[PDB]
Amino acid sequence: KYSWETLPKKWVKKMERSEHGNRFDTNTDYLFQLLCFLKLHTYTRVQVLIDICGVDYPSRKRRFEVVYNLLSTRYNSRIRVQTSADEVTRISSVVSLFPSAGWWEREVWDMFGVSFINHPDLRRILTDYGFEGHPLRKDFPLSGYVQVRYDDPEKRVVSEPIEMTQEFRYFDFASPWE
Amino acid sequence: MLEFAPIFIYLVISLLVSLILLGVPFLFASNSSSRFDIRFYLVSILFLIFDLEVTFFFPWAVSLNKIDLFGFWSMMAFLFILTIGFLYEWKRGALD
Amino acid sequence: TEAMIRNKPGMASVKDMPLLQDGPPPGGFAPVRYARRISNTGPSAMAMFLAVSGAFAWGMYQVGQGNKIRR
Amino acid sequence: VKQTTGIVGLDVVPNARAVLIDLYSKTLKEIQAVPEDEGYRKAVESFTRQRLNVCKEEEDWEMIEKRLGCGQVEELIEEARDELTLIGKMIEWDPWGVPDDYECEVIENDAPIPKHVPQHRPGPLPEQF
Amino acid sequence: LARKGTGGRSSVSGIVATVFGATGFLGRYLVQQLAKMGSQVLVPFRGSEDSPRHLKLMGDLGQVVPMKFDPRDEDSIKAVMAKANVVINLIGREYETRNFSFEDANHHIAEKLALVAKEHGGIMRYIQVSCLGASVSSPSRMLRAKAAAEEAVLNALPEATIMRPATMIGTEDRILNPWSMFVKKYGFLPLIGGGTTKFQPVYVVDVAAAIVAALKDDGSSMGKTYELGGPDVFTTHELAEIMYDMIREWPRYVKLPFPIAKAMAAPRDFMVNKVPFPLPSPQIFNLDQINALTTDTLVSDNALKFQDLDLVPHKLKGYPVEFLIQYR
Amino acid sequence: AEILGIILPLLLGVAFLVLAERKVMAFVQRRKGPDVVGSFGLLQPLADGLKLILKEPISPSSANFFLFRMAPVATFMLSLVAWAVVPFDYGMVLSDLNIGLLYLFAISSLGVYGIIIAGWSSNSKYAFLGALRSAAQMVSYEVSIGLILITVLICVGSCNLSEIVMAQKQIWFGIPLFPVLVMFFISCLAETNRAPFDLPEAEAELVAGYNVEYSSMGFALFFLGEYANMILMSGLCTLFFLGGWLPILDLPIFKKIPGSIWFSIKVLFFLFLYIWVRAAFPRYRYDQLMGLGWKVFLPLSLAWVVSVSGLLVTFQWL
Amino acid sequence: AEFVISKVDDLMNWARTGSIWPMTFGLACCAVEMMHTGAARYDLDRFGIIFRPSPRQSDCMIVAGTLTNKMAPALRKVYDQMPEPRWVISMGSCANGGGYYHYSYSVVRGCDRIVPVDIYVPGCPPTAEALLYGLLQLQKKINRRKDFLHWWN
Amino acid sequence: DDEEAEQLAKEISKDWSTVFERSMNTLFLTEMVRGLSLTLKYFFDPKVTINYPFEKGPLSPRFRGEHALRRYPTGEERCIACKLCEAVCPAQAITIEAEEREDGSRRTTRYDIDMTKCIYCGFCQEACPVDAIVEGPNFEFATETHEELLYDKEKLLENGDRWETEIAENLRSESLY
Amino acid sequence: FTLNFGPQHPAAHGVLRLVLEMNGEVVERAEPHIGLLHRGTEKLIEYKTYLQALPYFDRSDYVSMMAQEHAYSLAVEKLLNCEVPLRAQYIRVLFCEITRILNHLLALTTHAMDVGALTPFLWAFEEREKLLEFYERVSGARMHASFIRPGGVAQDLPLGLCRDIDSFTQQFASRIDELEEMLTGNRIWKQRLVDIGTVTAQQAKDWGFSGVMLRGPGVCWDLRRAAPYDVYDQLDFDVPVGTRGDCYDRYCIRIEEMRQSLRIIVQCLNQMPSGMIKADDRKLCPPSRCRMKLSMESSIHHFELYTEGFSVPASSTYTAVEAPKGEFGVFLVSNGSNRPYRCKIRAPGFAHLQGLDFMSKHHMLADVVTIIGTQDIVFGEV
Amino acid sequence: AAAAAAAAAAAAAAAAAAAAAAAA
Ligand SMILES: CCCCCCCCCCCCCCCCCC(=O)O[C@@H](COC(=O)CCCCCCCCCCCCCCC)COP(=O)(O)OCCN
Ligand SMILES: NC(=O)C1=CN([C@@H]2O[C@H](COP(=O)(O)OP(=O)(O)OC[C@H]3O[C@@H](n4cnc5c(N)ncnc54)[C@H](OP(=O)(O)O)[C@@H]3O)[C@@H](O)[C@H]2O)C=CC1
Numbered sequence A: 001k002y003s004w005e006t007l008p009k010k011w012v013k014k015m016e017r018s019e020h021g022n023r024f025d026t027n028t029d030y031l032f033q034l035l036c037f038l039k040l041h042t043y044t045r046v047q048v049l050i051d052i053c054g055v056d057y058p059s060r061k062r063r064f065e066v067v068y069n070l071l072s073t074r075y076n077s078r079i080r081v082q083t084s085a086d087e088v089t090r091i092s093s094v095v096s097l098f099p100s101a102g103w104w105e106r107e108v109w110d111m112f113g114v115s116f117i118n119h120p121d122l123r124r125i126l127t128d129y130g131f132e133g134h135p136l137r138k139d140f141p142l143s144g145y146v147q148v149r150y151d152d153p154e155k156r157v158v159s160e161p162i163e164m165t166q167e168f169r170y171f172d173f174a175s176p177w178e
Numbered sequence B: 001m002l003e004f005a006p007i008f009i010y011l012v013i014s015l016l017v018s019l020i021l022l023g024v025p026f027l028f029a030s031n032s033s034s035r036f037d038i039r040f041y042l043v044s045i046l047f048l049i050f051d052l053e054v055t056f057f058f059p060w061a062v063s064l065n066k067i068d069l070f071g072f073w074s075m076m077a078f079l080f081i082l083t084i085g086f087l088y089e090w091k092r093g094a095l096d
Numbered sequence C: 001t002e003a004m005i006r007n008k009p010g011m012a013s014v015k016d017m018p019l020l021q022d023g024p025p026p027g028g029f030a031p032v033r034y035a036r037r038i039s040n041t042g043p044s045a046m047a048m049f050l051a052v053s054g055a056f057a058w059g060m061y062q063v064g065q066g067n068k069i070r071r
Numbered sequence D: 001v002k003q004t005t006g007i008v009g010l011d012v013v014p015n016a017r018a019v020l021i022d023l024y025s026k027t028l029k030e031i032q033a034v035p036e037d038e039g040y041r042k043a044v045e046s047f048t049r050q051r052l053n054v055c056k057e058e059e060d061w062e063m064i065e066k067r068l069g070c071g072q073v074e075e076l077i078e079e080a081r082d083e084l085t086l087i088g089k090m091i092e093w094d095p096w097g098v099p100d101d102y103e104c105e106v107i108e109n110d111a112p113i114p115k116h117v118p119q120h121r122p123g124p125l126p127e128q129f
Numbered sequence E: 001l002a003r004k005g006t007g008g009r010s011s012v013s014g015i016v017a018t019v020f021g022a023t024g025f026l027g028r029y030l031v032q033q034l035a036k037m038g039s040q041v042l043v044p045f046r047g048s049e050d051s052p053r054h055l056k057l058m059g060d061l062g063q064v065v066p067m068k069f070d071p072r073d074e075d076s077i078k079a080v081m082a083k084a085n086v087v088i089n090l091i092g093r094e095y096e097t098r099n100f101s102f103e104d105a106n107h108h109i110a111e112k113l114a115l116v117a118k119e120h121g122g123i124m125r126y127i128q129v130s131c132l133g134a135s136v137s138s139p140s141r142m143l144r145a146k147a148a149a150e151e152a153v154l155n156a157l158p159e160a161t162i163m164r165p166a167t168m169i170g171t172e173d174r175i176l177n178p179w180s181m182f183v184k185k186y187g188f189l190p191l192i193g194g195g196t197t198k199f200q201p202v203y204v205v206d207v208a209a210a211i212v213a214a215l216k217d218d219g220s221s222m223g224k225t226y227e228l229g230g231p232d233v234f235t236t237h238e239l240a241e242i243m244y245d246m247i248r249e250w251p252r253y254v255k256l257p258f259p260i261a262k263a264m265a266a267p268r269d270f271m272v273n274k275v276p277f278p279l280p281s282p283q284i285f286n287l288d289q290i291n292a293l294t295t296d297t298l299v300s301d302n303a304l305k306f307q308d309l310d311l312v313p314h315k316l317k318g319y320p321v322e323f324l325i326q327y328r
Numbered sequence F: 001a002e003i004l005g006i007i008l009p010l011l012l013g014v015a016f017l018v019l020a021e022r023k024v025m026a027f028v029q030r031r032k033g034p035d036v037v038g039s040f041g042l043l044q045p046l047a048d049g050l051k052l053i054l055k056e057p058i059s060p061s062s063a064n065f066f067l068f069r070m071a072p073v074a075t076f077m078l079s080l081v082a083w084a085v086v087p088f089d090y091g092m093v094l095s096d097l098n099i100g101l102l103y104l105f106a107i108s109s110l111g112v113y114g115i116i117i118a119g120w121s122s123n124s125k126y127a128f129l130g131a132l133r134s135a136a137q138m139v140s141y142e143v144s145i146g147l148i149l150i151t152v153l154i155c156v157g158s159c160n161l162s163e164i165v166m167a168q169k170q171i172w173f174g175i176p177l178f179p180v181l182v183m184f185f186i187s188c189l190a191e192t193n194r195a196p197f198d199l200p201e202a203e204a205e206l207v208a209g210y211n212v213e214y215s216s217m218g219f220a221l222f223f224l225g226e227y228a229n230m231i232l233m234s235g236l237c238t239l240f241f242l243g244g245w246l247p248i249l250d251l252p253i254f255k256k257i258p259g260s261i262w263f264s265i266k267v268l269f270f271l272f273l274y275i276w277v278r279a280a281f282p283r284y285r286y287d288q289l290m291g292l293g294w295k296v297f298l299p300l301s302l303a304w305v306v307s308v309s310g311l312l313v314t315f316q317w318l
Numbered sequence G: 001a002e003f004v005i006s007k008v009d010d011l012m013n014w015a016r017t018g019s020i021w022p023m024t025f026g027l028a029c030c031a032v033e034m035m036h037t038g039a040a041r042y043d044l045d046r047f048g049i050i051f052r053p054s055p056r057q058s059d060c061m062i063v064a065g066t067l068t069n070k071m072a073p074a075l076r077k078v079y080d081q082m083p084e085p086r087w088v089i090s091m092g093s094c095a096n097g098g099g100y101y102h103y104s105y106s107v108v109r110g111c112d113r114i115v116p117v118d119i120y121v122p123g124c125p126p127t128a129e130a131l132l133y134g135l136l137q138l139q140k141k142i143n144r145r146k147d148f149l150h151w152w153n
Numbered sequence H: 001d002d003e004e005a006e007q008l009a010k011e012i013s014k015d016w017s018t019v020f021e022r023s024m025n026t027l028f029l030t031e032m033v034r035g036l037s038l039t040l041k042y043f044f045d046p047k048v049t050i051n052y053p054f055e056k057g058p059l060s061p062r063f064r065g066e067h068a069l070r071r072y073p074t075g076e077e078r079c080i081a082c083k084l085c086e087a088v089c090p091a092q093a094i095t096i097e098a099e100e101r102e103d104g105s106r107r108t109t110r111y112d113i114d115m116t117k118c119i120y121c122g123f124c125q126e127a128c129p130v131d132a133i134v135e136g137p138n139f140e141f142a143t144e145t146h147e148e149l150l151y152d153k154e155k156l157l158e159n160g161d162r163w164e165t166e167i168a169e170n171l172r173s174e175s176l177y
Numbered sequence I: 001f002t003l004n005f006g007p008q009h010p011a012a013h014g015v016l017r018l019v020l021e022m023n024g025e026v027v028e029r030a031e032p033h034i035g036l037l038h039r040g041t042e043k044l045i046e047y048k049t050y051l052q053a054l055p056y057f058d059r060s061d062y063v064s065m066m067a068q069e070h071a072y073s074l075a076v077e078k079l080l081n082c083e084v085p086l087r088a089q090y091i092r093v094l095f096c097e098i099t100r101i102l103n104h105l106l107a108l109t110t111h112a113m114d115v116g117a118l119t120p121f122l123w124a125f126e127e128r129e130k131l132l133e134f135y136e137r138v139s140g141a142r143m144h145a146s147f148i149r150p151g152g153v154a155q156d157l158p159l160g161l162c163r164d165i166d167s168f169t170q171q172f173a174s175r176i177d178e179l180e181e182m183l184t185g186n187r188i189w190k191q192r193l194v195d196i197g198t199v200t201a202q203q204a205k206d207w208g209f210s211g212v213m214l215r216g217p218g219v220c221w222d223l224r225r226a227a228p229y230d231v232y233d234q235l236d237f238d239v240p241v242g243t244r245g246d247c248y249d250r251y252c253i254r255i256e257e258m259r260q261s262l263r264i265i266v267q268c269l270n271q272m273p274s275g276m277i278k279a280d281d282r283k284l285c286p287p288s289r290c291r292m293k294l295s296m297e298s299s300i301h302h303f304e305l306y307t308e309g310f311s312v313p314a315s316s317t318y319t320a321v322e323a324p325k326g327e328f329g330v331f332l333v334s335n336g337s338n339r340p341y342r343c344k345i346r347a348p349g350f351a352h353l354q355g356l357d358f359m360s361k362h363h364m365l366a367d368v369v370t371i372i373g374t375q376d377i378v379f380g381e382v
Numbered sequence J: 001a002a003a004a005a006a007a008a009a010a011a012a013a014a015a016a017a018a019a020a021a022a023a024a
């Protein structure tokens, strides 16, 4: 792939794949710098941040994995630059390069908790207003912690008490022999 | 004027009718089931002016056989001055 | 199985299985239109102005004659 | 003579060839500030030289497009100016060179993907004209 | 009781209550307590099925089962109290209605529910709710009836708690919401008797919290007539002073001598006479509420207060009166 | 008096116009409108009414009763009093004013008050600015209706509406001044709100655009007012331009020529045109709308007063 | 006798069942199915149902789609400003009960947690006729009101 | 540029008897009278509407409506308690508890589909091995109260016996797929 | 000056909760508020098998249902390497394209009802109630037809569906013409749409529009021509691409894309090979009812595919199709287990509704509903 | 207000497909 020859070797730091869509699992420090490359470059012109997929691996040490997808409307190719930032590592924000990253990074911080550096208006986009907790993590239970909301003598108001529901039935379908 | 008395009583009888239409809902259903938009002053002054000029149109409209071709041209001069005012308002851009 | 679900008595072989499922008839469907066939066969620019202007030319003469009769 | 680029915002430039020559000369001059043994400088030098050459040889914008098969000269100017931005950016936060540890794990999964799945096909070659 | 849960809204509390007065201002807070601590509530309604609709929520899928019943017809009260172990009684009126008289709505019902619960052996706790100072020889026929109700619910059914809530304040109440909407007669508040009345209101949430607290309690609070008074013994004028703090209005009271009021409330007391028309529920001027307003016996004596329920009432300033903001 | 015989049938007319609009505008959309309530939805207006009457208020608020509880009364009384001078047949006008037309103009100039007051008493900045915008629109297409009426007045002798409908015995002013009928209709569409011209009446911005205290009576009275104002402003496109109560004058043997029936047929045509033109056309945005009443229907109205005055002065047709 | 009361209740119920304009809280697809129930084939303007765009004047409120924990206060605030003879219809599984998202943290387990509901149109994507039958059941709920007989106790 | 674009887009239509054509279209609405004419054609055409309670919209035997537990022609609930539908259910609506009945053949003591917590995707009809659970074309079961909408353990889903005459038809016609 | 512009007409744009910071009538910034429709879809899918995950996709975009099941299926075949037949591909496109028509018929005339034209809504919804006679006939549910399963497609068309889709396609050019004659020519339409929400191509690329809002600006970019993911490389159709970018170009595209989708429907009808309906790999496709009952080895797979699942191998792919809203892509990380692992759903309307901030700057407040119109903002995907 | 007004003039309608009409 042409993109790996020109790219500074240090920027594609950790990993690199070659199927199911190619990816440059880079380091969080060289990320927005790597996103600056592949865009505003004559032979690699992405210009289009398709998606920013937070992925949570609890068993890693760098829990999350902020998977930046990238389409190249010019050369008709799609590259998936990734990162790895745990719960308390502010990662560089690429809203300055692709302004679509604004809401995607708001969602990545909301769902997961990967705060974004110098991202203007980094505010919970999806979850409730007084939401405490980050849903799309793994350790966040499906039904939520305190997320039932019912009406009450505090009229015109829906409270936010601790939650109780028919227990979500987790089925252990997974079979041995893989 | 003689025919103004029917509408004179019309105002009061329609007042009564609307008062009944007001009291009908009130009786039933018992216990159990921008700093300033000056364009609104420009539009307003401009309607004032154009309704003044329609007020001047009305007698000229109803009496145009009397004023044969001279009242017509005098009204067309008044209307050319109206049109100059209206073109100064169109170009200056008060109609927006 | 799959030779006991699609029987077709006989057939001597696993091929030639019935295989009757939905599809276009032999010869496809009719050629379906997709373009915009908006017929512009109305009154032209003229004939509409000249109907309006003609109505004004004669109808206003009729307004005049009616004003003469009323007077 | 070009009426308009179909793209909105990419305004047609009449002096396409001249500003392209300017931009490619600027690029060749500015790329000298990166170390020579970096793939980025070999790439920039090579394609900027090719496009500057084909822009100097041909005269019309249409012939520039036809030989240099890279779309439209307005998009070519966008690419060249973005490349100048990148070279003036790369001078800063210089990423050139490889630190001693340099652990880079190339991972290859070769599972074939079924053909009827979005696969980004190459598209027309510069024989489009 | 047989509680299998953690909090409420899906827990169980072994309290399959039948809050007889649930479709009412006190009822909506009591039902919410009983069905937010996770217990069934067999809310019986009297007429329009829209009455207990605001109670189908605040209870999780059958924790609140609104049921239809006729007040004068038994064999229906027995059907409402078929599957029940707690029976609270909030059925009471402050105004005589042409069909149900003061006794037939305050005393002759509480006695009837008492008897038909006694028969249905299994009603562990039967709470009986009557106004504070509802002792015999009280002027207001509502309080004499509500006293006879206590005397007949204790006799016909001993170990039956009797709350004595004083005038209860809160949203959709009958004490503050009539004064407002009469301040909408241009700030004109007709405090009757000159505000010399001394009555102890109480945030209805705390009356409910006491009615449930006598259920969650042990064998005690049985046959012991509490007096759910509240804090800050007020006077009618002083209580009105707090309304005008919430609703932005200027205090413009007037005094009304009791003869003037009883003459102003002399109409709407022909309820038994004007048969072909029901009167519109006298809100502020109620001859019986005025007879009660005369003597300031609405103060908690040495009888059991909230303190005997490990409970302390909220004040009457701030949130427990912030339902008045909707009048500003 | 006999004002009952012109307000009650007009009340029924408005109540059945809500159904006529829903039903016609539905037939346009390939669907039957209100069709279950009555035999053909004929009782649907009574159902809407009897529902709005039986709806408990959201808040009583009978205190503020002189400010905006008589402002809908004012709007409706004006929409109903502009019906006096409207003649339905020869000698069927309630009060033949020799300045009838100017009186209609004045009634509109007071409907402006109706709107402005009923919007100011709604203490909602968005709703009040909406009412002010609606008043400025209703009053900006009033200079154009004014000049259109000056045209149809030049053609006629006097402002007497019975004369304006009697001055068309020879030919309706719809045939020679058809371009004017199109401008009066497209103005009566815009003077009233119910039109391609109803951004202040954009489905949501209308309800939250007239008052805050609805109580149902306010909602019905505004809509009863809008539908009477519509029956009226359609009973003007049929006096002035169409022959008020005049037949085509072919004098058929099958047709005994009733007058009020012809006036009814024509006002039905213009009401059906109100509906049809509400169905088939997008809204004008109130920023192109005000730029259509000044920059389009005022120049094209002024030209018409000079054209129908000229062509009638040169040839002595006056 | 009582017959006059029976007929005045029949009349009030005929009104409230003929013209029942719902504030269609069309959240999600069940609003697209509700739009099909308002569309040409299954008319809702036939049965009098006029989709109001404002909570101020509306007899009903056909909440559809997933009531999110964030759209719960807005739904409650809208329900609190309908005129008292109001009803609520839950349309779709997500609106009536927890639904596909019963165990989602952000989804309330049925609008029956925010507004008191009177007819739950069943089926996660209810057929447009099914929502129409839910409304024809709300019409029954009206025809069983007899509010005058209860005002006379 | 927009200034020059305007100048040129107005110098494209700049020849007499074309300025006149465009003027006439603006002066007398032409595109708009083609809107009114189409609207009228639809005002007079037959109406694609359906007076619902008496005639209902077309469906298909694959239509997924009210869930019904089928039975074998000779009584005996078809629902052997494999719990495959309880497993396949995306919303986990079906709660199945199983007990060897006295006859000895397994059966579900509790088969409760929660219709409110149910997405009507027909996965249960596919997953069930014996076609025990199928969706009856009912779709008209709007309930006044939520508790009724939770379909009880094998008692209300056993009302599919009434719908068997249509469910057996739909299955006999769909089983070819 | 802040204005809480909510859902103007509910039931059309459900939970639209913009907070407009206006300047008189000129909007200075539009701040959309998301989450009012944020069901836990990107979390709930981590908890269910790859089969149970599919019904969420028809519930992601509620006006174009099967396009998202087709984008998910192509993300659990990108991993599974699950070659589907030709008939499955042709049906899958004949319904992805019927869905493009079902969406443009809504997203045009719901937009045209927000602008004010009331009748195109009801004509297009009669058309949509004709196409739901195909959805409801081929799968069962009129809207959420959980029909495009991972391997192939759920079950074959009924024996009379291509004849009916033909009898519909013959009469559908006329319906598009009516939707066009009623809106395209109108001066009240052009005026309401021309030069409204103009997006220069650099902006449509920056903000990741990638839909009918990336072909307005003139960027010729259709992921059916770029990344042909089915018979699309065999089917002939021209992608209409705008030249100005204003909301009147996006409308003209959506009304031509509704004709090219008609071409694709007519092709898929005229060339639909009589082949198997699902992939022959019975460990990714549950065997038919007839086979699993008669064959013991098929019964085992019907049991381990409707309870266990596929257990698609460990990988992570971003499969993006051209859904009607835009490039709907589902980034599907897959732990080896039978349940997905962070099935992230890139949904246009999350990138488009971002564009509302800059699209509707300096446009009048009444235009902010036209922008929301042409973005085809469906909040299920947001 | 100096905000850019929506000028309702433009270029005339010409359906613009992609270059892949006949031979890709
Ligand atoms: C062919 C017959 C037509 C009949 C039409 C009947 C329609 C009646 C119902 C209402 C229709 C829809 C209303 C639409 C409102 C908006 C109309 C409008 O203003 O359109 C344009 C103006 O239209 C009108 O004003 C129409 C009024 C016609 C009046 C007469 C015009 C000239 C008459 C010439 C007479 C010739 C003879 C006279 C001398 C002999 C505005 O310009 P624009 O912005 O659309 O585009 C150009 C921008 N510069
Ligand atoms: N409100 C106050 O300020 C005070 C009240 N109390 C007592 O608290 C209790 C509840 O108060 P609150 O809810 O405000 O009272 P309400 O007057 O609002 O009535 C509450 C309940 O009583 C029912 N009820 C009343 N009379 C009858 C009757 N004749 N037949 C059947 N049901 C009847 C009502 O049924 P329906 O709604 O159908 O009429 C409703 O369910 C009563 O005992 C009351 O006297 C104590 C202190 C003062």
Ligand code: SF4
Residues within 6 Å of the ligand: G027, G028, G029, G030, G064, G065, G066, G091, G092, G093, G094, G095, G099, G100, G123, G124, G125, G126, H119, I059, I144
């Ligand atoms: S219940 Fe089903 S159809 Fe209704 S909104 Fe929820 S997912 Fe959509």
Ligand code: SF4
Residues within 6 Å of the ligand: H067, H085, H088, H089, H090, H091, H092, H093, H094, H113, H117, H118, H119, H120, H121, H122, H123, H124, H125
């Ligand atoms: S359709 Fe069947 S499997 Fe799917 S959610 Fe409903 S009950 Fe469960």
Ligand code: SF4
Residues within 6 Å of the ligand: H078, H079, H080, H081, H082, H083, H084, H085, H086, H096, H108, H127, H128, H129, H130, H131, H132, H133
């Ligand atoms: S319904 Fe089907 S899947 Fe469910 S227990 Fe019965 S046989 Fe098994």
